[PDB]
C-alpha cells in the first residue's frame, strides 16, 4: 500500500491539528531553515514506533507543543498515519500522548505496542530494522559502516539473529571454550543443526539482496560499467563475521569505500537501501536530505530511479534543500514558521505536475 497522509496534533512545533499531505507517489518536503522540517521527520519516526530518547527530548510530554517552555498547548498530542491499500478501506495507525504515556491505536482501537509493531510488520514496515527511514547526515554511513554492523542488519531483517542465543549455547556444549574442544556425535549434531538453521535464515535474505544489488547499483548509476558486490568475510558462517560491500563506480577505476566522494558513497548507500527493499519491500521510504552530497548528475539519476519506481514498487517522501532534487517530485509540502510563544510550524501543498518540466 502507501502512506496517504499524516495527521498531526500539537506535536513539537506542529500546533493544533494539521493534515500533512495527501502524498503523491514522489513528494518532497521543503522549507526555509527553522520552519519545522526536522520536527516533521520526528513525527514520522514517532508514529512508526521510535523510542522517545531518539526524538530529541528528555521526556515524552516534552513532545507536546509548548511543553519545553512550560507552556504546553494541551494534555495530549498525536501523530496518525493513514495507510491505503488497493481493494481495502483506509487503515489508521496512531500514537497518542496521554498522561505522559504513549497509547497506540489501529482504526481508533487501542492496542499494545506488540500488536502495533506486529500489524506494521505485515505491511513491510519493520520498526526495529527501520530500513525505510534515512535520517539527515546518515546516508553515507549506510555504505561506510562497519562490516560487522552490516551483518547485524541482515540478522535483524532475516530473523536469523533470533537463533543466536541457541547457537551460542550449542557451540559451548559442543566444547567451544575448552583447550581442546571435543564433542560427541550428538552435541556436534545439535550444533550443526542450529548452525544450519541460522545459516538458512540468514541466506534466505542475504543471498537475495546480494544477487539483486548489482542491477540496482547499475540502474542508479544508469551505466553498465558500474558494479556492486556484497560478500561475507565468513562464507561458511556469514552471521559470525562482517559483510563486505565494495563498488566500482562507472567510468571509474576501483577504489575502496572510504576513498569515494560523499556523493559516490551516497549512491552506494541507496543501492543497498533499495536492494534490501527487493527482498522485503517497504511501502514507503522517508529520506531526510539524502541529496546533501549529490552533484546535479547524481541528483538526476536518483530522482529518475525514484520516479521510474514510485509508480509500482515504492513511495518516496523526501526532505530536500536542493531545488534540483525537489523540482523532480510530483508535489511539494512546504513548511513555514509562525510567530508565537513557541515556533509554530504549518504546511502548504503544491502540485508540480501542472507545469511542464521544460522550456
Amino acid at each position: 500500500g502507501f502512506l496517504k497522509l499524516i495527521e498531526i496534533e500539537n506535536f513539537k512545533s506542529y500546533k493544533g491539528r494539521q493534515i500533512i499531505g495527501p502524498f503523491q507517489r514522489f513528494t518532497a518536503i521543503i522549507g526555509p531553515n527553522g520552519s519545522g522540517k526536522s520536527n516533521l521527520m520526528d513525527a514520522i519516526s514517532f508514529v512508526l514506533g521510535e523510542k522517545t530518547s531518539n526524538l530529541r527530548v528528555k521526556t515524552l510530554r516534552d513532545l507536546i507543543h509548548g511543553a519545553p517552555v512550560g507552556k504546553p498547548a494541551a494534555n495530549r498530542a498525536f501523530v496518525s498515519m493513514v495507510y491505503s491499500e488497493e481493494g481495502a478501506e483506509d487503515r489508521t495507525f496512531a500514537r497518542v500522548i496521554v498522561g505522559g504515556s504513549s497509547e497506540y491505536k489501529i482504526n481508533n482501537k487501542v492496542v499494545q505496542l506488540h500488536e502495533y509493531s506486529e500489524e506494521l510488520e505485515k505491511l513491510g514496515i519493520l520498526i526495529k530494522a527501520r530500513n525505510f527511514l534515512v535520517f539527515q547526515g546518515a546516508v553515507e554511513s549506510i555504505a561506510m559502516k562497519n562490516p560487522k554492523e552490516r551483518t547485524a542488519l541482515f540478522e535483524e531483517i532475516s530473523r536469523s539473529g533470533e537463533l543466536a542465543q541457541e547457537y551460542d549455547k550449542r557451540k559451548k556444549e559442543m566444547g567451544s571454550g575448552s583447550l581442546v574442544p571435543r564433542g560427541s556425535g550428538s552435541a556436534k549434531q545439535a550444533f550443526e543443526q542450529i548452525k544450519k538453521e541460522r545459516f538458512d535464515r540468514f541466506n534466505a535474505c542475504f543471498e537475495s539482496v546480494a544477487t539483486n544489488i548489482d542491477e540496482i547499483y547499475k540502474a542508479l548509476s544508469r551505466n553498465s560499467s558500474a558494479q556492486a558486490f556484497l560478500g561475507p568475510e565468513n562464507p561458511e558462517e556469514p552471521y559470525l563475521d562482517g559483510i563486505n560491500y565494495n563498488c566500482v563506480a562507472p567510468g571509474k577505476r576501483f577504489r575502496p569505500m572510504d576513498n569515494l566522494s560523499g556523493g559516490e558513497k551516497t549512491v552506494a548507500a541507496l543501492a543497498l537501501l533499495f536492494a534490501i527493499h527487493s527482498y522485503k519491500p517497504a511501502p514507503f521510504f522517508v529520506l531526510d536530505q539524502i541529496d546533501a552530497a549529490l552533484d546535479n548528475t547524481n541528483i538526476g539519476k536518483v530522482a529518475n530511479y525514484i520516479k521510474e519506481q514510485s509508480t509500482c514498487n515504492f513511495q518516496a517522501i523526501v526532505i530536500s534543500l536542493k531545488e534540483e532534487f525537489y523540482t523532480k517530485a510530483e508535489s511539494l509540502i512546504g513548511v513555514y514558521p509562525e510567530q508565537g510563544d513557541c515556533v509554530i510550524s504549518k504546511v502548504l501543498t503544491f502540485d508540480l505536475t501542472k507545469y511542464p518540466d521544460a522550456n
Binding site: 493534515i19 499531505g21 495527501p22 521543503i30 522549507g31 526555509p32 527553522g34 520552519s35 531545488e323 525537489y326 523540482t327 508535489s331 511539494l332 512546504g334 513548511v335 513555514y336 514558521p337 509562525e338 510567530q339 502548504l348 501543498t349 503544491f350 502540485d351 508540480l352 501542472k354 507545469y355 511542464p356 518540466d357 521544460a358 522550456n359
Partner: protein, 68 residues
C-alpha cells in the same frame, strides 16, 4: 516615482505560476514560504492543493514588485 507602485489586496500563487515551468513555479512557491517566515505576507490555503493566497503581513518588505 516610487509612490506609484501600487498593488493588489491579494496575490494568487496559481495565477503567478500561469505559463511557468516546474522550476519557476517551485521557486515562487518557495518564495512564499520565505516571505511568510519574514512576516511580509499572510498565507491562506483553503484545503490541500487549493490555490495559495498571499495578503500583506505585519512587517514591511521591500522589492515586492519583483517578488510578485
Amino acid at each position: 516615482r516610487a509612490l506609484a507602485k501600487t498593488g493588489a489586496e491579494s496575490i494568487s500563487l496559481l495565477e503567478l505560476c500561469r505559463n511557468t515551468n516546474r522550476k519557476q513555479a517551485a521557486a515562487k512557491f518557495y518564495s512564499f514560504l520565505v516571505l511568510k517566515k519574514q512576516q511580509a505576507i499572510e498565507l491562506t490555503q483553503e484545503e490541500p492543493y487549493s490555490d495559495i493566497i498571499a495578503t500583506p503581513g505585519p512587517r514591511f518588505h521591500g522589492s515586492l514588485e519583483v517578488l510578485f
